[PDB]
């Protein structure tokens, strides 16, 4: 059976650095954990799979190779993405009183 | 859908029936058999001894060689006599 | 790359987004409209608009240029002249350096072609490869090379580097087989004999100064010493070299491939070599 | 009449190779023909010039109309604009004027008016491409 | 009046029928199959122009050469006449020489 | 246990392998069962949309044989005699009732016979087109790597629901290594679907890759494609057709 479709909206959690470093400690230690290199497939997979399971938002294949460091992973996960359609994006943008937008789709 | 099975070369030798009138003549001679043997080895079913000239063919080849390709000694003798005449 | 990021941002690439590279598709010009219609670029009356102007080279009745010039034998017998693809020592050294030609084994036309150092067209009356002195002053490879022609300077360079060069003849059929052996082996024919040079070429290949493959080997040391003296280098005694056997290997004058005799059939399908045993066939293939 | 044997080594010797062999290791460079492998590690420049499948520098003379002489640096990766700046700097003293060039950012090529194949090959060798 | 007064019956195209869906498959049979088969061997059509292209004169010469003996009498006569006409046109008419 | 794939072929020193999530079709949620390293020269080449267009048009047109034919004035029935004399009749001059000017006459410049549009791009160009298509799918997040095409059931509804749940496109091109080894479950599922098309690796092409929104590859297919496409780089001039024996070519 098809579960409810996963909403693509994603808001980075406030304690994102703390959660990320906890996961990094779980997977891999040294100072400046931001600069830990993810060159190892095992470690990269463990970290990214844990993060995806926890936050409900995975690194796409397109960006996957760019995650050279935990700093890159943090950058990817601290940028929000909204799944609202253009209809919402326009209507909920403080339309002036003389502008009316209707959608028949 | 699912793709139809990929086109593949017909495996093994292809032996056309000589009785059929539509079989091209180049597919019935010994050269076709020789090429089939070269391509497929023992699976061809071509008797390997057929790849060499039969005695009449060998006689024809030898006659042609004697007629057109002289021996090194004959060539050298002709060259020597030509040089002698020119000198 | 930033281009792939731009793709990630852009809409999906589909069959509705495709465009030819600008400048690769000229517009088609067709005779409709004011500028390309009416007379449609053909002029006004006369044979040129009618489409019936005389043949190319016709000069209106005046004796044509290409006919008023006397006939001369510039191209007489062109299709029977022998052609030899040049192989400069520069090119040979380049191939050896890039490992496309292995100097540790005898270098013959087959090895040159397999390394793609030369392209032979027997159908275009190529009779083989001629060594060319170009690059001699920087040639530093010890090689055992078999060619069809060789310049004196090229021989000198080859020998000074401690190698051996021999000029070997090939008839068109043997040359085709040597250049492309695999297709010949797929033809399923016994390996033919290598024919002897024509009478005009016999002296060249029997002369030791050319390192002819039919020349008396007794005269080779004298010729090599003469070249060493002429070009001011000390002749290295290759017999002392640890590759002397390789430098000495020479296929028999009637042999096309080094280790294969005339008359053998190469069954590549099952990695075998069938050899005739009939006395008549053996005598023929040894003659 | 027929006698089979396994002397197939002399046929394996005739079989040609489909893949271009990697150049053998040489004790001393540049090689007598002048060839030189790219340095290891690669230079840290913003751009990279990959060698041709023959392991040569991809710098080619080109001619059009019988009088337009050009030189093309073809297999460029990275900042083709950084490469263009470097090429202009390297070539202006030779010409006395900044060379006129075209940057095909799509195909990753740099086309320079005039023949500079030898100079650009030497320059790229020095840079270690 | 050279205009129809009613809309034509709607034309419905199934972009995902089997033919369109599998179009192009095995076009890379060679480069992806050790070159056992050339892509032109995938071409289904007249025997005389499978994996070959030419102008009309060359096409007619090839057709006569390859299936001329199997052609009907008047079709072959028409082909011979067409070859003759095309020879005359291509070798004697035209703007360029 | 993660399914981790490494790049078998040598990778250029200046380039790092691109990466993809190895997924599985066994469950709606099995979106990350491993990590695959994909050769950068096959999955991160330049976005040559012009080459994509070249290869797509070659695919569309090289097989084309138009069967349109019209009758010339020679082949139209009749029309031998001059309809009426040159002079005296008061009518226009004509030489046969089948000239193009006449109703029912021949077509002056019509489609002539079955015409082929055959032409071959260089095989290097076609292989480059395949590489560019793969890079484009990966970069646009339409490429998904599966460990295998095995399905829990052969029900097409399961496959459609899986695609919808994973937010795949309306159309999916599933690719498996060889025709014979394709799992029976996926074979059954895709035999009844129109927009989910299952092909062997040897059938992969730019046209179908573009027609289908998402491209699903198996790990063996990825290895196979990398090998075949990278071989085009670093190969000599052909001495003779590659079908013939070579020292190192299967
Ligand atoms: Mg005008
Ligand atoms: Mg007029
Ligand atoms: Mg006039
Ligand atoms: Mg050019
Ligand atoms: Mg008539
Ligand atoms: Mg009609």
UniProtKB/Swiss-Prot annotation, chain A:
One of its GO terms (cellular component) is cytosol. It is found in: Mitochondrion. Coiled coil: none annotated. One of its GO terms (biological process) is mitochondrial translation. Keywords: Mitochondrion, Ribonucleoprotein, Ribosomal protein. Belongs to the mitochondrion-specific ribosomal protein mL50 family. Component of the mitochondrial large ribosomal subunit (mt-LSU). Mature mammalian 55S mitochondrial ribosomes consist of a small (28S) and a large (39S) subunit. The 28S small subunit contains a 12S ribosomal RNA (12S mt-rRNA) and 30 different proteins. The 39S large subunit contains a 16S rRNA (16S mt-rRNA), a copy of mitochondrial valine transfer RNA (mt-tRNA(Val)), which plays an integral structural role, and 52 different proteins. This is Large ribosomal subunit protein mL50. It comes from Homo sapiens (Human). The gene is MRPL50.
Curated annotation (Swiss-Prot), chain C:
GO terms for biological process: cellular response to leukemia inhibitory factor; mitochondrial translation. GO terms for cellular component: mitochondrial inner membrane; mitochondrial large ribosomal subunit; mitochondrion. Pfam families: Ribosomal_L27A. GO terms for molecular function: RNA binding; structural constituent of ribosome. PANTHER family: 50S RIBOSOMAL PROTEIN L15, LARGE RIBOSOMAL SUBUNIT PROTEIN UL15M. It comes from Homo sapiens (Human). It is found in: Mitochondrion. The keyword Cell division does not apply. Residues 13-57 are annotated as: Disordered. This is Large ribosomal subunit protein uL15m. Component of the mitochondrial large ribosomal subunit (mt-LSU). Mature mammalian 55S mitochondrial ribosomes consist of a small (28S) and a large (39S) subunit. The 28S small subunit contains a 12S ribosomal RNA (12S mt-rRNA) and 30 different proteins. The 39S large subunit contains a 16S rRNA (16S mt-rRNA), a copy of mitochondrial valine transfer RNA (mt-tRNA(Val)), which plays an integral structural role, and 52 different proteins. Keywords: Mitochondrion, Ribonucleoprotein, Ribosomal protein, Transit peptide. Belongs to the universal ribosomal protein uL15 family.
Curated annotation (Swiss-Prot), chain D:
Disulfide bonds: none annotated. Component of the mitochondrial large ribosomal subunit (mt-LSU). Mature mammalian 55S mitochondrial ribosomes consist of a small (28S) and a large (39S) subunit. The 28S small subunit contains a 12S ribosomal RNA (12S mt-rRNA) and 30 different proteins. The 39S large subunit contains a 16S rRNA (16S mt-rRNA), a copy of mitochondrial valine transfer RNA (mt-tRNA(Val)), which plays an integral structural role, and 52 different proteins. Interacts with OXA1L. Keywords: Mitochondrion, Ribonucleoprotein, Ribosomal protein. It is found in: Mitochondrion. Ubiquitous. GO terms for molecular function: structural constituent of ribosome. The keyword Ribonucleoprotein applies. Signal peptide: none annotated. The keyword rRNA-binding does not apply. The lineage of its organism: Eukaryota, Metazoa, Chordata, Craniata, Vertebrata. GO terms for cellular component: mitochondrial inner membrane; mitochondrial large ribosomal subunit; mitochondrial ribosome; mitochondrion. The gene is MRPL49. One of its GO terms (biological process) is mitochondrial translation. Belongs to the mitochondrion-specific ribosomal protein mL49 family. This is Large ribosomal subunit protein mL49. Residues 19-41 are annotated as: Disordered.
Curated annotation (Swiss-Prot), chain E:
It is found in: Mitochondrion. The keyword rRNA processing does not apply. GO terms for cellular component: mitochondrial inner membrane; mitochondrial large ribosomal subunit; mitochondrial ribosome; mitochondrion. Its main location: mitochondrion. Keywords: Mitochondrion, Ribonucleoprotein, Ribosomal protein, Transit peptide. One of its GO terms (molecular function) is structural constituent of ribosome. One of its GO terms (biological process) is mitochondrial translation. It comes from the Eukaryota. Component of the mitochondrial large ribosomal subunit (mt-LSU). Mature mammalian 55S mitochondrial ribosomes consist of a small (28S) and a large (39S) subunit. The 28S small subunit contains a 12S ribosomal RNA (12S mt-rRNA) and 30 different proteins. The 39S large subunit contains a 16S rRNA (16S mt-rRNA), a copy of mitochondrial valine transfer RNA (mt-tRNA(Val)), which plays an integral structural role, and 52 different proteins. Interacts with OXA1L. Belongs to the mitochondrion-specific ribosomal protein mL51 family. This is Large ribosomal subunit protein mL51. It comes from Homo sapiens (Human). The gene is MRPL51. The chain holds residues 32 to 128 of 128 of the full protein.
